[PDB]
């Protein structure tokens, strides 16, 4: 469940199929965006996990697993940034802000696209009888 | 596995059964690719575009001009096309603080138009998105409770009126909505 | 010293006799020395099917032997024949010098080296694996991982939470053959009142187990400050207990013997129990489509004995003061009224105002929950489809109104008085419509007003103003009328 | 401040429930009891007071017992009391350094004591066997230290020293009652246990009216009267443990915090009786040694004279306890002076301990002012004036009652001294009240 | 660094080693 | 004489345990005392013939 290995798959495909040059930058930007998203998510989830652990409702090994993921994310982001420098020269200071923006933009786009599916669950759950033009015919 | 088109430069998964996360990621990659192909400068800036904003404003104004003409059906279509173009033809790296307020400003008018027209489920979903994306105002809960009362959901209508009064306790319309909700719920329970 | 062991069986009989009497005496002495009406206890076992009875069924000699041993040893003592100190011991001789000399030391070595550390490590590894709530560590890890990566755009339903439950690690310890898809299928078969065919004795086990799982899931979802998942978990608990899928007209479909194909097709305006009790006692049967008086009385007795709530007075209280001040510790005090779906509304002004006040004494304000802890327990619920037997419960959780996040773990109450549901107050009917408060039997001192006190867990803010909250008190058994109120604390200094 | 890397048990990151604490306490106690029964291998100066007070037995792996740990603890307690370590609560690294220096000095003390006992003790001078005999004590003392540290880190209901002492006291009480051993002195076989010999004489003698009076008195060995008296004294001491003065207090920093501050009767229970007992033991030892070394001296005759062994006609004769009611009724002046001395010593020791240990009313008033609490129906400037009327009287009367209980127990001839029974009762009541106030099975 | 089970194992091992040394020294004299 | 006066005043001001509390106190403390004493006595009694055989 990640965009990490998809970039590596596209990279390995590049050496054989002669794909364009911007597909690699697209996959790289997507990976950086996902890394930023996960870093912020962990940064906001740390206190709640800590309190659940102190109260005694999470176990003893999950806390170590969480503290390991906290640094795995930083390692992955540093690797992404090094690859970004390798792929285009002098593109390390703008890459981070561009990723920071695309993260929010694509999250908003997902939330907006979800409403078409969100609309039929409520019809099924409340037993609405709606004809064309969205009006209620009871 | 996943195949790469030649003339269209779009990557597609050749597999028969693909997960949802993989499909969302491939769609995002396709969007980034078709944006980078068009954007010519290698060191692109988060500065928003101008021609795209001019076209979106033109579509939105051509949609709003039908309200003065008292044509309520096609103005909604024009506003919907404007919102679709704003969501489709805009690059992901453009500024968030300039991309979100325009969506709010157009979705508000689309909501008003759908509520005047008679579609309450579409309007309710638009209110729910506009409320869950970070816009909490007493002018939203009025419309949300109106929709929930129009499609006969009284517990949620009461909760919405209560949360709307918890933010602006001096409002004069949420009080009438709460009175109507209490009356309908007392007739529903007994 | 240098002891001398008993070589003629002259001392160890008395020692063994004393050791036996010191254990027999107290046991014999102990053996010689040794508020809430439930109406559904009888009506439940008459509607439970035999397939669940079989599941619920299937899934002092020490004193006598000690006394006969004492008699044998006493007769043996009486049958026997009987300057520096010569010390001695009481144990027999063959225990230390006969042919059983290495047996004692090998038994000591074994019982000290193998049985002790093995069992200690087993107990340690078995007590270290479970969570303080009562669920496995892997189950809690799965729940936390489910709530970590949860898309807020997705809407929570019952199917989603069943899919989440089907991955419990404790379902695999019972039946290591089945897969999570089979568990989800069995849960759907239970809720939709379908016949599994062969795995009924596994359906019943996992359904009875879902109690602790749903409680732990509710705990974790309140720990992550999520309201939608908490409400979904409570609704799923209701559906699992009553064996009914969540629909609009569910309060009237949880009843014992109704036919959905007739009720749903004929009427469409009856959605609650009060709307049902608006009609006469024969029109209710004609609408529900059962037309059997001896069989209508049971459903009419079930429909008018499930509890609904209602508030009389709700406010924030701080123990020892008269108002809320910045950085103080208040709590929530509710005065509710458990009523039947058949009784009319009594005006709040009729309450004598003597039952709503709080006593101001040091013994009462040192701990304000002792008076609440005196109420009777809740009676047994009417759930003919749940395998085991359940007592009722109410889960009360409080959240905020500025952002809309749950701000503390849920309190679960178990003691409450259902006195207002007894059949002696049957004059108080909704259909008579004659202002039954001016009745010869109506005495406002006979109706009980229960109390609920929720510790708040967070002190008042350091600023000054009105801060609004939201309190929700839901049942975990029925589809009754719950509480949903908003209240503000006026931190005034 | 230095470098130290030595084994130690890590504290639990979270609170341990009550059952996991009780089971670990039981297992540690079982290990400590099994360790003291197995003798050494290289084996081929009797100090009964030290071995009885410091939970030790000679000729086994537990010869030193908890002696080095308790000596290091007392040494560093004195060093902290004399304000030489100048330990400040503003730093935690200083506390960690002190706690690790505790163990790094305790291990050296263990090594030195083991070497001294091996080179001087009655084992014998004749080298690998001596190395093995020293290594046994080395590893046994290390195990005891690790066990105490484990029980004190949070896996046990409390400390280790108090638990071990209470266990030894209870074991002695029960062995003096249910001893299976016998003694044959002319008359025949007679059990050394009260209940065992009671049942034996009730069964085999076949003369009940005589067997009862013979087994109930037993002037030479333990009898049933002492069992009855010690049970009665146990129940009475348990009743006097619940006495407490509860004054109502309320908070003013964060309002809505109402509580009760209890002031027990046994304010400083364990300290005065144990200090007085150690003092009398040391005095008796010194007097015995000086009387043995010197045939006759005026001041040596005055301090203490020993005869048929027990002290008589001397200063040490007065301080020695009365055995039974006969000695009491014989000489009234000795009873008077002994009672007065034993009560005054306890009272003064209790007052001195509440003045030294930092539990004086002034320190309690300072703590009240710090936390922000006040007395319910009184002012702010009067908390100290109110505590002065409560705490000193409580300490004095607790000491006097402990002394009176010890005298009554030693006079009624129970199975154990009143000091031992009271210490064990307080040690167990501590665990009981902790489990009650915290909440656990 | 050290767990409670490690302390229990060390204690039981030391006790069993001493007991085994004793019984071996006892059986050696009986054998020769 | 005033010493005993302050003592009896403080005793009259204390809080003595009642029956429902004294029973719990005696139960807990007696069970603990017996659980310790029986363990000690059994460990002391078992190791006599073992120490005779081994040593």
UniProtKB/Swiss-Prot annotation, chain A:
<dbReference type="GO" id="GO:0071256">
    <property type="term" value="C:translocon complex"/>
</dbReference>
<keyword id="KW-0472">Membrane</keyword>
<dbReference type="GO" id="GO:0030867">
    <property type="term" value="C:rough endoplasmic reticulum membrane"/>
</dbReference>
<dbReference type="GO" id="GO:0031207">
    <property type="term" value="C:Sec62/Sec63 complex"/>
</dbReference>
<comment type="similarity">
    <text>To S.pombe SpBC409.21.</text>
</comment>
<protein>
    <recommendedName>
        <fullName>Translocation protein SEC66</fullName>
    </recommendedName>
</protein>
<keyword id="KW-0735">Signal-anchor</keyword>
<keyword id="KW-0813">Transport</keyword>
<dbReference type="GO" id="GO:0005789">
    <property type="term" value="C:endoplasmic reticulum membrane"/>
</dbReference>
<dbReference type="GO" id="GO:0031204">
    <property type="term" value="P:post-translational protein targeting to membrane, translocation"/>
</dbReference>
<keyword id="KW-1133">Transmembrane helix</keyword>
<comment type="subunit">
    <text>Component of the heterotetrameric Sec62/63complex composed of SEC62, SEC63, SEC66 and SEC72. The Sec62/63 complex associates with the Sec61 complex to form the Sec complex. Part of a complex consisting of KAR2, SEC63, SEC66 and SEC72.</text>
</comment>
Swiss-Prot record, chain B:
<dbReference type="GO" id="GO:0031204">
    <property type="term" value="P:post-translational protein targeting to membrane, translocation"/>
</dbReference>
<dbReference type="GO" id="GO:0071256">
    <property type="term" value="C:translocon complex"/>
</dbReference>
<dbReference type="GO" id="GO:0030867">
    <property type="term" value="C:rough endoplasmic reticulum membrane"/>
</dbReference>
<keyword id="KW-0813">Transport</keyword>
<dbReference type="GO" id="GO:0031207">
    <property type="term" value="C:Sec62/Sec63 complex"/>
</dbReference>
<comment type="function">
    <text>Acts as a non-essential component of the Sec62/63 complex which is involved in SRP-independent post-translational translocation across the endoplasmic reticulum (ER) and functions together with the Sec61 complex and KAR2 in a channel-forming translocon complex. A cycle of assembly and disassembly of Sec62/63 complex from SEC61 may govern the activity of the translocon.</text>
</comment>
<dbReference type="GO" id="GO:0005783">
    <property type="term" value="C:endoplasmic reticulum"/>
</dbReference>
<keyword id="KW-0963">Cytoplasm</keyword>
<dbReference type="InterPro" id="IPR011990">
    <property type="entry name" value="TPR-like_helical_dom_sf"/>
</dbReference>
<protein>
    <recommendedName>
        <fullName>Translocation protein SEC72</fullName>
    </recommendedName>
</protein>
<dbReference type="GO" id="GO:0008320">
    <property type="term" value="F:protein transmembrane transporter activity"/>
</dbReference>
<keyword id="KW-0653">Protein transport</keyword>
Curated annotation (Swiss-Prot), chain E:
<comment type="function">
    <text>Part of the Sec61 complex, which is the major component of a channel-forming translocon complex that mediates protein translocation across the endoplasmic reticulum (ER). The functional states of the translocon complex include co- and post-translational ER import, cotranslational membrane protein integration and retrograde transport of misfolded proteins out of the ER. In the cotranslational pathway, ribosomes synthesizing presecretory proteins are targeted to the translocon by the cytosolic signal recognition particle (SRP) and its ER-localized receptor.</text>
</comment>
<feature type="transmembrane region" description="Helical">
    <location>
        <begin position="4"/>
        <end position="24"/>
    </location>
</feature>
<protein>
    <recommendedName>
        <fullName>Protein transport protein SBH1</fullName>
    </recommendedName>
</protein>
<comment type="similarity">
    <text>Belongs to the SEC61-beta family.</text>
</comment>
<comment type="subunit">
    <text>Component of the heterotrimeric Sec61 complex, which is composed of SSH1, SBH1 and SSS1. Presumably three to four Sec61 heterotrimers assemble into an oligomeric ring with a central aqueous pore. In cotranslational ER import, the pore diameter varies from 9-15 A in a ribosome-free resting state to 40-60 A in a functional state when associated with the ribosome. The Sec61 complex is part of a channel-forming translocon complex whose composition seem to change dependent upon different functional states.</text>
</comment>
Swiss-Prot record, chain F:
<comment type="function">
    <text>Part of the Sec61 complex, which is the major component of channel-forming translocon complex that mediates protein translocation across the endoplasmic reticulum (ER). The functional states of the translocon complex include co- and post-translational ER import, cotranslational membrane protein integration and retrograde transport of misfolded proteins out of the ER. In the cotranslational pathway, ribosomes synthesizing presecretory proteins are targeted to the translocon by the cytosolic signal recognition particle (SRP) and its ER-localized receptor.</text>
</comment>
<dbReference type="GO" id="GO:0005784">
    <property type="term" value="C:Sec61 translocon complex"/>
</dbReference>
<dbReference type="GO" id="GO:0031204">
    <property type="term" value="P:post-translational protein targeting to membrane, translocation"/>
</dbReference>
<keyword id="KW-0813">Transport</keyword>
<dbReference type="GO" id="GO:0030867">
    <property type="term" value="C:rough endoplasmic reticulum membrane"/>
</dbReference>
<keyword id="KW-0811">Translocation</keyword>
<dbReference type="GO" id="GO:0005198">
    <property type="term" value="F:structural molecule activity"/>
</dbReference>
<keyword id="KW-0812">Transmembrane</keyword>
<dbReference type="GO" id="GO:0071256">
    <property type="term" value="C:translocon complex"/>
</dbReference>
<dbReference type="GO" id="GO:0005783">
    <property type="term" value="C:endoplasmic reticulum"/>
</dbReference>
<comment type="similarity">
    <text>Belongs to the SecE/SEC61-gamma family.</text>
</comment>
<dbReference type="GO" id="GO:0006616">
    <property type="term" value="P:SRP-dependent cotranslational protein targeting to membrane, translocation"/>
</dbReference>
